[PDB]
Amino acid sequence: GRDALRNNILAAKTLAEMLRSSLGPKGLDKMLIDSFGDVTITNDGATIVKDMEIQHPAAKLLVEAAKAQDAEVGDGTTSAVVLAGALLEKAESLLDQNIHPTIIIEGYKKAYNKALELLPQLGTRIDIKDLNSSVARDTLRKIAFTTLALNKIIDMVIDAIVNVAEPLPNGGYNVSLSINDALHALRNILLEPVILPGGGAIELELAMKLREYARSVGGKEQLAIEAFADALEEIPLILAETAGLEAISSLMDLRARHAKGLSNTGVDVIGGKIVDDVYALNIIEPIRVKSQVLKSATEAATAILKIDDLIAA
């Protein structure tokens, strides 16, 4: 294939591989080291991506996309990189079948648009009409802990967050800002309100729909979209890997369930099991985050794909 593009894809892919381990709630720690020997140890992809040194320009670019994604929204920094590397890895198969990368780019673009179109449908709304006492706030707390992972310190953060004024109609609350990511998450939940079933359920459903859509698009772009879907299904796989069991079998089981009209099922990492409903266990993601992850990943992957060669300046 086109050697430059392959080298790039490889670099991005290796960085993704490095970051795959630090995904989910039971993500392993990375050991960051300064030029002076000072050591920081963390499983936060934001920190890893931000502080780390990387020489290859493709990986650098991917990191740039990740950072921007981390700026626009506090969460999803690892997910974007992992998904980008995934998209490139799945693209590789198509490049090997002699499919020109602009076609792949187009397919990925269509897949992304469709996904972003489907997200709001596959989500579930929350009550923005009021901050009323009855169980509107208590359900957010669950997401807060879901982000954190404490009998006290519960009410306090919510009240401290409620202090800050604003409704906006379209329900779009504005706030002038582990604790950080929690505040970020809550903010993101309000800023546009829909919740999404975490633990990979969204990826799985999105993939299942995208294949059908791919069958409509029909061309090589069908293969590109189907690749996008396969690339989306890599996150549930990893989460299942952190859960412990043989990833593929679980991926298949999950897929099975999504076929059923079980519609959403997910992998409970901490529980180390697959669960029929991830809302029940309050495994939730803000759509604000997921959409940003999709955008960032697809932009990164197409960007890598759109580069033909390297020239000395």
């Binding site: 990368p101 580069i307 390297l310 020239i311």
Partner: protein
């Protein structure tokens, strides 16, 4: 074939083609540039790629300057001039191996050039500043799949609007001074918003908080300190902590490009001067002018490469629409004009001496190369699409039938709104022909001082 100087020059031209070949057409690839150990640049832009890359070769460094036509006409149509030169060079190479002397080749290429230019002159459709549809389509054609943050249709509208604003009429011929246009840029998130301003945008925070945010009908003019301030305000200012209080008592700016100052001087020869808040920052807006031709475009994007690329693409699109307006001619792009050219060349070639006839035919093939590149970059089968269009172009009713790089099928490019300026294509043909004839005429390379 002949002397190694010629072989080397031709190799150089071909090399310079290879540097831009992949980026030809709407669905074109980007190139990555790496400068020192400091920074990198990812772009789809002939000018930028040619400028950033190492030009440490005597030949070719000339090709770049010839490609950038010494005329108001300067664009990414430079890519065309360069890629063409590369093609005419490779087909020349095939002639030299038949021991056709460079003289005959050059002659043939000159004839073919004349016929090509004539063909472009014939096919070209008239177009005025009133034809918003066409101008919009041209602007949209210039931005074909360019990595621009802004909506391309919206941005195209903005381009047409700005160029329409700038335009003045000179003796039955419109004229567009794109210097009147400002292009400032800033990147955060929730950005890839693109804004059109009918004045000037000064990108800087107000010097002092306690200071008139707004200023109505601002006459523009941009103890020692007190004396100076008093003397200045005797008749907003732009260029010490003590002066801030003075001006606060009496709007200001810390640092502004001299370009902004120029464009300000032009724009104001001043009804509103505001301080507006961009997403996550503030800057100064000059709205209204004692100038009916000034305008500015605020291109703000999420990521810097994208913003820069947006600026480049924007400038180019502005350029193309400008050229369209000034020359008042346009042509169906997508490969139609080139096919017609090749057709006429093969038609005319037998009416010329044989050894030149071969050169002319070779010119036609060199032209047709471009279309194959357009198809290549779209991931299509080049020969198929070529022979397909060539076949369809046997009717005069298909003079505008070109390649749709997204559907893969040949279509009436004029109706699809795939439209280019004739002046550009002509100038490109001229530039390429000049370049290759120059390379051909050179016999040897001699050191001097």
């Amino acid at each position: 074939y002949g002397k190694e100087a010629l072989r080397a020059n031709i190799a150089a031209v071909k090399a310079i083609e290879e540097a831009l070949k992949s980026t030809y057409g709407p669905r074109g690839m980007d190139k990555m540039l790496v400068d020192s150990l400091g920074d990198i640049t990812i772009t789809n832009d002939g000018a930028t790629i040619l400028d950033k890359m190492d030009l440490q070769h005597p030949t070719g460094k000339l090709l770049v300057q010839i490609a950038k036509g010494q005329d108001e006409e300067t664009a990414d149509g430079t890519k065309t001039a360069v890629i063409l030169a590369g093609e005419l060079a490779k087909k020349a190479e095939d002639l030299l191996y038949k021991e056709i002397h460079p003289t005959i080749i050059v002659s043939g290429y000159k004839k073919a050039e004349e016929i090509a230019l004539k063909t472009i002159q014939e096919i070209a459709q008239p177009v005025t500043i009133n034809d918003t549809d066409v101008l919009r389509k041209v602007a949209l054609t210039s931005l074909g799949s360019k990595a621009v943050a802004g909506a391309r249709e919206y941005l195209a509208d903005l381009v047409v609007k700005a160029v329409a604003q700038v335009a003045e009429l000179r003796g039955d011929k419109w004229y567009v001074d794109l210097d009147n246009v400002q292009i400032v840029k800033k990147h955060g998130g929730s950005v890839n918003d693109t804004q059109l301003v009918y004045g000037i945008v000064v990108d800087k925070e107000v010097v002092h908080p306690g200071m008139p945010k707004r200023i109505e009908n601002a006459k523009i003019a941009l103890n020692i300190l007190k004396e100076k301030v008093d003397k200045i305000a005797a008749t907003v200012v732009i260029c010490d902590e003590v002066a801030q209080h003075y001006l606060a008592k009496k709007l200001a700016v810390r640092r502004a490009k001299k370009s902004d100052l120029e464009k300000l001087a032009r724009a104001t020869g001043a009804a509103l001067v505001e301080e507006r808040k961009v997403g996550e920052d503030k800057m100064v807006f000059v709205e209204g002018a004692k100038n009916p031709k000034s305008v500015s475009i605020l291109i703000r994007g999420g990521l810097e490469r994208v913003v820069d690329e947006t600026e480049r693409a924007l400038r180019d699109a502005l350029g193309t629409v400008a050229d369209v307006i000034r020359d008042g001619r346009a042509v169906a792009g997508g490969g139609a004009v080139e096919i017609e050219i090749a057709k006429r060349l093969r038609k005319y070639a037998p009416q010329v001496g044989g050894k030149e006839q071969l050169a002319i035919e070779a010119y036609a093939n060199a032209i047709e190369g471009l279309i194959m590149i357009l198809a290549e970059n779209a991931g299509l089968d080049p020969i198929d699409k070529l022979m397909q269009l060539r076949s369809l172009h046997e009717n005069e009713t298909n003079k505008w039938y070109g390649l749709n790089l997204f559907t893969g099928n040949p279509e009436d490019m004029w109706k699809l709104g795939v439209i280019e300026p004739a002046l550009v294509k002509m100038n490109a043909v001229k530039a390429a022909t000049e370049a290759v004839t120059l390379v051909l005429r050179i016999d040897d390379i001699v050191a001097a001082g």
